[PDB]
A paper describes a structure:
Contraction of φCD508 in urea reduces the tail length by just 20%, whereas most CIS tails that have been described contract to ∼50% of their extended length; the outer diameter of the sheath increases from 230 to 250 Å, and the inner diameter from 78 to 94 Å, sufficient to break contacts between gp55 sheath domain I helices and the tail tube gp56. The contracted sheath retains the arrangement of gp55 subunits in a six-stranded helix, but with a decrease in helical rise from 39 Å to 32 Å, and a concomitant increase in twist from 19 to 34°. The measured 20% reduction (48 nm) in tail length is consistent with a decrease in helical rise from 39 Å to 32 Å for 57 rings of sheath protein. The contraction-induced movement of the gp55 sheath proteins can be modeled as a rigid body pivoting motion about domain I. The overall RMSD between sheath protein monomers in the extended and contracted form is 0.63 Å, confirming a rigid body movement of these proteins. In both the extended and the contracted form, the sheath ring retains integrity through its mesh network, similar to the sheath of other CISs. In helical reconstructions of the contracted tail, the tail tube cannot be resolved because of a mismatch between the helical parameters of the sheath and the tail tube. As the tail tube does not contract, the resulting mismatch in length drives the tail tube through the bottom of the baseplate. Furthermore, the X-loop blocks complete contraction of the tail for φCD508; we modeled the φCD508 sheath proteins into a more contracted conformation, based on pyocin trunk structures, but increased contraction of φCD508 sheath proteins led to steric clashes between the X-loop and the neighboring N-terminal linker, as well as domain II of a neighboring sheath. In the contracted phage tail, which lacks the packing interactions between the tail tube and the sheath, the bending stiffness (persistence length) is also significantly reduced.
Here, we reveal the extended and contracted atomic structures of an intact contractile-tailed phage (φCD508) that binds to and penetrates the protective S-layer of the Gram-positive human pathogen Clostridioides difficile. The virion can be divided into five distinct regions: the head, neck, tail, baseplate, and needle. Structures of purified φCD508 virions in both extended and contracted conformations were determined by single-particle EM of frozen-hydrated samples; the resolution ranged from 2.6 to 4.0 Å for the extended phage, and 2.9 to 4.2 Å for the contracted form.
Numbering used by the authors:
A (entry chain L): 13 to 79
B (entry chain S): 13 to 472
C (entry chain M): 317 to 472
Write the structure that this text describes.
Amino acid sequence: EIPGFYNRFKTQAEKSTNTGLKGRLAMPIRANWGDVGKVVTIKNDLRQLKNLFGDDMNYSAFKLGKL
Amino acid sequence: EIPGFYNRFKTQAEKSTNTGLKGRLAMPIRANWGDVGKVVTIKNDLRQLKNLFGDDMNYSAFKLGKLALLGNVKELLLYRLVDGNQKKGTLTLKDTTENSAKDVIKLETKYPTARNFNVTIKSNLVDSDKKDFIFFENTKQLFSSSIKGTIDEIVLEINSNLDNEYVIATKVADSDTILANVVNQALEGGNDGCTSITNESYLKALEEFERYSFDSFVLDGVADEALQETTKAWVAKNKELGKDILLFLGGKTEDNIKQINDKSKSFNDENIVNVGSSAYYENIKYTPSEVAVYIAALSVSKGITGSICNAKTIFEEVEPRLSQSEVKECLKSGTLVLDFDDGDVIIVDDVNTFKKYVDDKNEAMGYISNIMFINTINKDTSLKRKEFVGKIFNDATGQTTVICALKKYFEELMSQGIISEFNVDIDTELQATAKADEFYWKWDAVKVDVMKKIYGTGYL
Amino acid sequence: TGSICNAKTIFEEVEPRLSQSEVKECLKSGTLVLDFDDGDVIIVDDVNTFKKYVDDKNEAMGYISNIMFINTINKDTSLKRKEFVGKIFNDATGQTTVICALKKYFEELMSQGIISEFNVDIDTELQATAKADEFYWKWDAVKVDVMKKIYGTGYL
């Protein structure tokens, strides 16, 4: 680069981390909503499940995902 | 010098000083009066603003300047916006000795304008050849003078006294003849400054503003959308170029709180602050951008060692007015909105438009004070560039000197209490990969917080 | 013991004025152009016209300070010519004396910190092929660099 003193700040995840989670699980699911024909990874926030596959407890998807 | 005991007294500013001001602000302005095409710095005395840009509240210049000055900015930097047709007022004078009268003096306003600056010339009652030159604005007299009937001395006197600073006199011909009498003749031919002002004028003003350094920008108290995206891109460019400029914005008065929140969602760069609430100060309303001028001014005046989350405002009323649900909606949207928590108008919080997002750019980045802190650190560091770049040899000694200087700076910050904890060290991870002509370094810190929320529990 | 890549200039204005793209274009072209990085006029970099080419004449040769260093070494060495040429017998003693003098000079340079590492020795490859009335010698060095670029990363 050109000479100079160019800062690039990286307070991304300074101390916003916790180690209370582990493992990964497979899930065939019936769902009223969400993507079809693909294996999608869901982070442990249930909001992600609610967004990507709906919030209907009548279906295996949301109920088993919450469990 | 020659031998002797020569005193030179320096009771200039012995104890005539106070420390109640800080910060600097940028201002594109429309004005009826004042300099054009230059970025002029204004000290916080409003008399300076009144002198250099007039006292007309119909124009963005004086009104937004007064708001910024009440924001307690140390130095307010202005720029007069105009269309190319914008022009100075002018008047011409003629002799009377000759039957074929010839123009001999022309009067032109010192600054471009369209106001009714008027002039009167009459026969002097004491001396025969003298003419009494008097100047007005809508018959409100500015200055009076009397000079004999020679054109050179007349124009020299008219240009000499700064009481006649509103107008410049120039000689049209080298006559020694008696001038013609005029009575309250306006300096016509001028054009105002609100004439056909468009986005291109603001773009040119911003390009002029690229020269300087600022703590904040507010964009003339105008909420035009295309100007807002243009200024957003401009500030992003300035940030990438190492100029850390903060931007405040205010939505249109017609926008509902939902629309304001949508706009505050659209903006997500940390250097963008969207203002929703309108207000009254002297029983006169202010659009969200006009009060965005004031909130930016107050923020920069606060500087470090402060915030705005409950700073009292000068405004006597605020609207639209929000329940706690609406306030929470606006804060979640990143909108900043004033509030009437008490009999005065009070700023609700320190939020910016970015606050809609959370984790990578941390939640403190959602607050304006943290951004001001980071910009200040970047600015002081980019001041250190010239001290250290190209002047020390990259050896262990040079690296140690740089680290020691940065440590001294951060310890100065610690002494002020702004930082609760810090460490600064060489970035040995990147220093291993660093080329021989460069240096990498790392630092952690913990800015000292402020009470926004407080809770009490009682036992009896 | 210095450079020009950010030396402040006496000039109150500079033109034509360049964005980072234009600056990078000029540096890649080997052009040297002043800049207005702050309220003063500042020299952008240490580049020379050669810098367009890269590897054989190394990238440091693209910088003027390295050329000044090399010219200074050549000048001091060509000053030593008159001390050593035609005045010492090419035996092991004369070669050792020449090498010791050059080592003393380079150690003086090391004391100033200009060089981070060096070695100077007889060029035994060419000395084997050398005619009896001549001498060959070799030296490696590492000039001490200067910060042109600096990068910082922050944690809060």
